[PDB]
């Protein structure tokens, strides 16, 4: 039990420390600006759209090279639940709410990205195989 | 939830329409020398429609019961300043 407590503590510390992250802010938008985020950026692994306090959180979709949309998983993060973190870095995004559509453009898309050697969202936390077998 | 309804007009009536039209054309051709349609309709007529609702549509949930959050949250005051 003592080893597990220290392991959990170190895991949370490493998740929160978040060092060595490069941020991309070259994002443009064009469409229905009333559902627009106040900010959008990506850290190399996820893309975050921060919305204001009064704005309804819209639905965000993944646009490929032919223009077709597909669902992308998202997690709602931030202290006031104002940020939507989508689990992919893509050049073009589509934001929808009701009958309004806004297209977000990544103007500095890095195709290479940074590899996920650890299995977690962090470069300082490993995911190890417990089940053995 | 509601959206755009597809009633399948051709899949329901095209067999009967085409059967009747070919029958009339055949009659005209045979006369110019000088029921299948109902049975197709009986089979193709009962095709339920299909609803198409796009993504990003706004909807509601009308809570049908009492939801109780006593066990998962509690309230504590934030001390002043």
């Amino acid at each position: 039990q003592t080893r597990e407590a220290n392991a959990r503590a170190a895991v949370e510390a490493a998740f929160e420390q978040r060092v060595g992250a490069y941020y991309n802010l070259k994002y443009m938008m064009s469409g229905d600006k009333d559902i627009a985020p106040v900010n959008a950026w990506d850290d190399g692994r996820f893309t975050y759209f921060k919305f204001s306090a009064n704005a309804d959180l819209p639905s965000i979709y993944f646009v490929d090279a032919e223009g077709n949309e597909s669902l992308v998983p998202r997690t709602t993060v931030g202290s006031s639940n104002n940020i939507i973190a989508v689990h992919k870095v893509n050049p073009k995004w589509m934001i929808r709410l009701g009958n309004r559509a806004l297209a977000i453009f990544n103007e500095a898309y890095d195709p290479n990205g940074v590899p996920n050697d650890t299995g977690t969202a962090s470069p300082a936390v490993r995911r190890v195989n417990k089940g053995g077998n | 939830l509601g959206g755009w309804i597809d009633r399948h007009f051709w899949e329901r009536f095209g067999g009967a329409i085409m059967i009747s039209l070919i029958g009339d054309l055949g009659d005209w051709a045979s006369r110019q020398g000088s029921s299948a349609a109902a049975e197709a309709l009986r089979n193709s007529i009962n095709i339920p429609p299909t609803l198409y609702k796009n993504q990003g549509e706004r909807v509601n949930i009308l809570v049908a019961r009492d939801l109780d959050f006593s066990d998962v949250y509690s309230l504590e005051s934030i001390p002043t300043k």
Binding site: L25, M29, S30, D32, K50, R96, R100, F105 | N54
Partner: peptide, 28 residues
């Protein structure tokens, strides 16, 4: 003869940066 409509496609004219200011989550 009829097909299910596509959703609204945003206009591609009023293209402007999303970020007027750097977010505080970047700590900048």
């Amino acid at each position: 003869c009829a097909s299910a409509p596509k959703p609204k496609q945003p206009s591609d004219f009023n293209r402007e940066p999303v970020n007027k200011t750097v977010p505080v989550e970047i700590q900048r």
